[PDB]
Structures are given as structure tokens and as C-alpha cells.
């Protein structure tokens, strides 16, 4: 069983740059016939993988000439000379030398832009929802960059964990930022027995982690 690892996991680049993706195999993918049994695939969200490179360096039919590949033995690399807007996707490398075939973690090529701290907002559960047994608190992280962000929920200044779910929008096609939605879920009973509900956002654009909150019965 051969292990394929890709680095980095995410890569920020701008249109016109020369991007290189690296793939690494636990053992040499060189075959007796002299060929290297490696595939390079491109995949856009909600779409099926497209073949780019067959046998490490061979450009697939139809694939644009800005794509090229190389590597020796265990370290391989895909290169996009002059990145086009159509090149923002996820690239996976695969080995077809031994069984079972194995892919890499994949590497996402996103649009590089300037840092931007997230505008935070915290919404308390509506009256209607409390009138139904459950209560869910929402924290919004609007337009920020880079994607990396930590949302820490605190109920009556007590850290929560395992009772919230995040969701992130795909990179914006105009300002290249991201937005995140953390949803803390509690029972009406649990909500009713606590006052202060906070949302602590830790981000690079913020020198110090911002904490938006609200006191239970004050709206």
C-alpha cells in the first residue's frame, strides 16, 4: 500500500502567477518500462475529476498547454505557468503502480488577496423557536481573509464544545473573501438557565480576538 501526500493543503495564488503543486509517494513510482505511474487530476466543486497528466509528465488531450509536470522517483510536481481564472480548483495526484490505487489529500488553489478582519454579528434565538422546545444561537463572520478562523462559544463565560456547527461560503468571485456561520444548539431549558451568550472570533486580521455577545433577557 503506497501513501501519497500533497503539500500544501491550501494554496493562495493570483491570476497570472506560476503555481506549482507537489505530491509525494512513500516509494518510487518508476516502472520497469521506464514510465512513472502517476496521474494528476483537477476537480471543481460539484464536478467529476478531470485528467491533466498521465504518467507524471504527459499532458492529457484537451488540457491547456500552460499545464506541465515533472518529478523524480518520490517527489512529483504539477505546474501552471500563467494561472487563468479557470484554474482555481482542487488538484489531486494518484498512483497507479500498485494496488490499491491511492490519491493525495488534494490541494486547493484559491484566490490570493489582502488580509481582511471579519465583521462579527451574533443573533439570539427567535421567540417562535423557543416556543417549539429548541433554541439555536447564530454567530456570523462576514467577508474575511484568509479562510482560517476559530469561533469559540461561551455561555455564561464557560467554553462550549461539541454543540455548534460551522458552515463556510465558497470564495467570493468579486472581493475574494469568505464568510462563516457558527450555530450553537441548546435546549429551551438550557437556554433559559443562562444569561450571557458570547461568540469569540480569533482571526489574523484581528490583533486581539473580538468577542460579540448579548445578555439573555435584554433584546
Amino acid at each position: 500500500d503506497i501513501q501519497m501526500t500533497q503539500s500544501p493543503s491550501t494554496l493562495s495564488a493570483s491570476v497570472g502567477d506560476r503555481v506549482t503543486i507537489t505530491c509525494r509517494s512513500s516509494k518510487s513510482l518508476l516502472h520497469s518500462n521506464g514510465d512513472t505511474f502517476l496521474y494528476w487530476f483537477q476537480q471543481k466543486p460539484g464536478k467529476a475529476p478531470k485528467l491533466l497528466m498521465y504518467r507524471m509528465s504527459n499532458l492529457a488531450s484537451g488540457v491547456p498547454s500552460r499545464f506541465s509536470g515533472s518529478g523524480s522517483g518520490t517527489e512529483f510536481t504539477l505546474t501552471i505557468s500563467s494561472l487563468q481564472p479557470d484554474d482555481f480548483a482542487t488538484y489531486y495526484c494518484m498512483q497507479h503502480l500498485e494496488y490499491p490505487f491511492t490519491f493525495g489529500q488534494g490541494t486547493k488553489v484559491e484566490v490570493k488577496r489582502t488580509v481582511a478582519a471579519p465583521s462579527v454579528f451574533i443573533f439570539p434565538p427567535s421567540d417562535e423557536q423557543l416556543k417549539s422546545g429548541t433554541a439555536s444561537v447564530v454567530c456570523l463572520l462576514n467577508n474575511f481573509y484568509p479562510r482560517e478562523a476559530k469561533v469559540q462559544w461561551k455561555v455564561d463565560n464557560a467554553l462550549q464544545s461539541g454543540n455548534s456547527q460551522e458552515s463556510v461560503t465558497e470564495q467570493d468571485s468579486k472581493d475574494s473573501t469568505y464568510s462563516l456561520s457558527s450555530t450553537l444548539t441548546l435546549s429551551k431549558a438550557d437556554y433559559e438557565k443562562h444569561k450571557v451568550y458570547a461568540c469569540e472570533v480569533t482571526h489574523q486580521g484581528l490583533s486581539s480576538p473580538v468577542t460579540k455577545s448579548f445578555n439573555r433577557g435584554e433584546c
Binding site: 504518467r55 494518484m94 490519491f103 465583521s119 417562535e128 456570523l140 464568510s179
Partner: protein, 219 residues
Amino acid sequence: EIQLVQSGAEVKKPGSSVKVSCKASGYTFTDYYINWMRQAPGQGLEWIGWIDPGSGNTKYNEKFKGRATLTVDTSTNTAYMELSSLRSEDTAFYFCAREKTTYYYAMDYWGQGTLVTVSSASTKGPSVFPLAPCSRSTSESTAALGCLVKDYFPEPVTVSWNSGALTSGVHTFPAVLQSSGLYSLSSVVTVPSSSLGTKTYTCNVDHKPSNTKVDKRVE
């Protein structure tokens, strides 16, 4: 015109079995091998196994042996992939790809994909809740508000604002699967706080599977 067409999406109960098809055309079916991969929601690709159309000879991944069963029907040029005793973890997209092998190896043509949602839930319209701050503040320049579309099945729901009159600044997050087996997402919009009162903001949620159409006026 070479192409591999897969069967439609399917919703299955845990413990049941699904059998996806991959119809081949535009080339000699028996000359190329058929591989089957799968890709979970937030994950990379993974190889299931392959099969030689010209003989029915197969090769499986240890993790899918017994569970997965690959077959072909040369009289119809159709490849099949049957997964038994389905669990929630089997929920993913299933791809079939051919592997040209005449003068070299290349997994060039892929099928469109077949989503297999392994759920125990049943069609349920969502409950739309208003997302608004505890108290309207004039301190900030822009204010944020939205709609929480909770507990629904299956996907998807289409949220809009003011019947399409408000599009800029809107952010509809991707649905998240709750432990209940029901989906839940939130749509938000940032607007000039210096118009929060004389201007009405309403989200129009639509869930076709349950024929539910909801408009919720937010603060």
C-alpha cells in the same frame, strides 16, 4: 464522442443496498478497464476497485471487499457497482472511470457521478426563523440580518431576498447535516443601518420536495 453516463442520485435507508450503473459509448467497451472511485462531502477521492469488461475480472480495495461488488454487462456496455449494508458513512458521490491502456495508462474519461445519500429521514419542509440583533444599533454603519432555515429534508432550499430585489451582500451558507438527519442552513444579508426601519427586508425560502414556500419579514 466518448462518454460514461451514470445512473441518477439515490436516497437509501441504512442496511439496504444500492447499485449504480455506468453506461459506456463512443469506444470499444472491452478494450479499457473500468474503475470506481468515491468522494464523501468534505473529503478527497478514494478508490473502490476496477473490473476488466473483457472478462469480468475484478480487483477490490480491502476496505470495500465483501461490501462492494463490481460487475459488467457487455451486451449493453454497462458497468455496475453495488454497495451492500449501507451506513451513513457511505454517503458520497460515486464515480466510474475508464483507463486507456493501449500505448500507455490514462484514466481519461469519467462518469458524471452518482450521489448516494444514506439517510433514514423522510421529506420534511423547513421552519424559517428570523435572524436579527437583540437591539437595533445606530453605532455601526452596516447592520446584518437573515433567516435560519431549520430542520428539512432532503436538499435543497433556495433562499432569496425581497423576491430578487436584494441580491448584493447576500450570503446563503451551505446546509449542515444535524444529528437528527435533517438539514439546516442560514442566509444572511448586510444592509445600511441608516434605513433599518423604513425599509422592509424579507427572505423567500423555497423547498420543492415538500412544496413549501415561506416568506419571513425580518425586523
